Ligand binder design. Sequence first.
Ligand SMILES: *[C@@H]1O[C@H](CO)[C@@H](O)[C@H](O)[C@H]1NC(C)=O
Lengths: 219, 219, 218, 218
Amino acid sequence: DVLMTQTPLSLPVSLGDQASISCRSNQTILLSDGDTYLEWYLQKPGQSPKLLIYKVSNRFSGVPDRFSGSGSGTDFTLKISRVEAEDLGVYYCFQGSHVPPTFGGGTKLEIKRADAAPTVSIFPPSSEQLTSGGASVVCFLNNFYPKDINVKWKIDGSERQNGVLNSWTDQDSKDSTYSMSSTLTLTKDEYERHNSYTCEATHKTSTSPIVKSFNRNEC
Amino acid sequence: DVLMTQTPLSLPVSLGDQASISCRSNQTILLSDGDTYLEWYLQKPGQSPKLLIYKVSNRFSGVPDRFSGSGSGTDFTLKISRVEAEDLGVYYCFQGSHVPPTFGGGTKLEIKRADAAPTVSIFPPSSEQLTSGGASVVCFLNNFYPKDINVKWKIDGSERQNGVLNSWTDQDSKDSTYSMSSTLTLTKDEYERHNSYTCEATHKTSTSPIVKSFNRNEC
Amino acid sequence: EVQLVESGGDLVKPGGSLKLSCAASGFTFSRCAMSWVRQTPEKRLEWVAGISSGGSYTFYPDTVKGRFIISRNNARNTLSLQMSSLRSEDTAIYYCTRYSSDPFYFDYWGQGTTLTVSSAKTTPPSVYPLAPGSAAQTNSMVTLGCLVKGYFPEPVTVTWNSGSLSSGVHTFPAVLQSDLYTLSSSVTVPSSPRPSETVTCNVAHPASSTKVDKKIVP
Amino acid sequence: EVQLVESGGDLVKPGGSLKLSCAASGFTFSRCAMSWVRQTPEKRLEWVAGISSGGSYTFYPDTVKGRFIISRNNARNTLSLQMSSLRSEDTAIYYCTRYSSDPFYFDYWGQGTTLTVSSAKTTPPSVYPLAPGSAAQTNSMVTLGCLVKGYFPEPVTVTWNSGSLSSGVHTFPAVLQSDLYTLSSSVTVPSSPRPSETVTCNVAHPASSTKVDKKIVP
Ligand SMILES: *[C@@H]1O[C@H](CO)[C@@H](O)[C@H](O)[C@H]1NC(C)=O
């Protein structure tokens, strides 16, 4: 069960740049016979893996010249020359020359991008929700770059909270931004014990926080 | 022992249509003596079975021409020509030509009426139950069609909980609907920890959940 | 009127023995052959014992051959099923049946008797009034209930206001928790009555002579 | 044209049994060996069975060894996995692949079936409409959304205005809270439709045939 280690794990490269992903093994994949059953796979967001390069370096059908496998023995390296948009995904190397076959950890190619700032929106609980006796305050941090953003929930003064669900979309294909969503869920009677819910975003495009807020009573 | 596969499990017919139930023997029911003794028995709900058809074609006395039996040897059919409301029951075909005699598993004839939406009602636990340590909060979802419905219990909105019993009636003879009961059983302590309790129904007639709640102290 | 009225079923612990019995009327008993057939749990119907008109030849499926005997007391127009070593697959409703003159199929079923075979102790119910609390308002109608919780064995009889209120009743099939049954019945009364007039559930659990009446008060 | 389609992934209580089939087509079966491969939740990939073209001999890693068997049928064109004694550590998307001629690496991967091994129950989603309140703002572009909270298992489908509003919707990944999923979707409409034209998100949870539509109203 030989375990492959891939480096890097994320890989910002500007369109145009070349990319190099290395997949070293803890065991000799070099085979005397026919130098190595190493293959490289691509998994585009929302698709099944496709084969790109087999037996260290032959490109499979329809793979462009821009892909090229290198290495031998125990160290192997995929190189992607002029990176285009459509090369977003994560790549996985695999060992076939041994039982069991062994996949790598995956390298996420993310396309560097002009920075962008989050289009933030904050939404109160609905009546529909409140009637079943729960309250979820939602804040969408839509369309930004890079990935790193920090969301603080404030309820009545600088009282932050504990009980927040955050999910990010993977890199948006052609537009190249990310998007995130944080939901703060309280019970109805604790939601009613307060009055200011503040979603406060901090992102490398500002020293000033994006603060979106509302005050608890429709009047 | 002759296996007798019946299908369908349930035949949803409307009043006025023709309906056919099929029954198959895994060995033949044709008796060399002259012929077969494949029967069809109806069990209208809460009553003991009654013979509709014997020796596959002939109706027992009482039985109206509307009920018609058929086949020979191994495939057998029962066709109700134009269904009246009081045909609801389970049909079992039977074979007497080979010892030991054996019956079909049944086909439940469901009268399909127009869609009807549940009338939902929720009960707090009784003090009597409560003073002896238990709490069952019960939700009745009455008079609906089709039978398919989903209920979920929310405690404090959060707890969608699971510790619950459900029960449906058969299709009601007098108007083709169903009823359902769901009972959340908790201990007095557990019960008294929370405040809002909720009965949430989702079912074809409405495109929004039907929600019913009580706060456990509202004054 | 052909009538087949069975008698006998009761709760029996799993090795016990019980003789069920059936009595017939309306027809010429001896001309006609008889049977016992059982309907289990998921409504599957098994034939369990045929006997000739003269009690000469008697027939059984292997499941019961040897531990169940059929008999037909023809002078007194009785028919009986003497059974022993009752394992739990006998738990079912047993129906006295009569064959036709062509004795390979049945043309009349009796009422049925139930038999429950388990170690489990008979337990009387606890009946709980289900008075509306809810959310939503009041107008046109109200619906009240009874939670007949924790009893063994089945049956239990629920009637609302002794039989006078039969409008909107539904008594739901009972489910089994930990060797103990729970069922409930709901009823719909006009909003005008249940405050001022009064509605009552009367739960009778026959296997312990428990009779409970519970008044639904707000 | 290599086509490989899997079926039968479902919700299983940890300890059960399930068989996933995979129908191959567009190439010659009996010449290509097959494989089944997994993608766990942390997107890690794991090979879990191998069978050589004639179904002659099956290969397994140790974790599944014992527990799953890999069939095939060169006439009807089907590969499969029989999974028994399911562990929660088998929760994954199950791909079936095609092995190349030197049957030591894969070249074509099927579409995948989700196996969720959990004691949880199927529960329909509550969907609540996220209607704009915010820090006021009627700009040019307003963002609406709707929350799909409390459902099991994956997946759910959110489309907007029956699919005729596919503009800038963002649907976020579901995440598990109290053993249950939660997913929310935003949409951005020009401020001049926001109320005047109706925006509605439509949710479908297939596992419990639920279909909900929520009009987003202010
Ligand atoms: C019919 O089914 C029963 C139960 O599976 C079996 O004993 C019998 O052999 C089957 N086939 C025939 C020809 O009876």
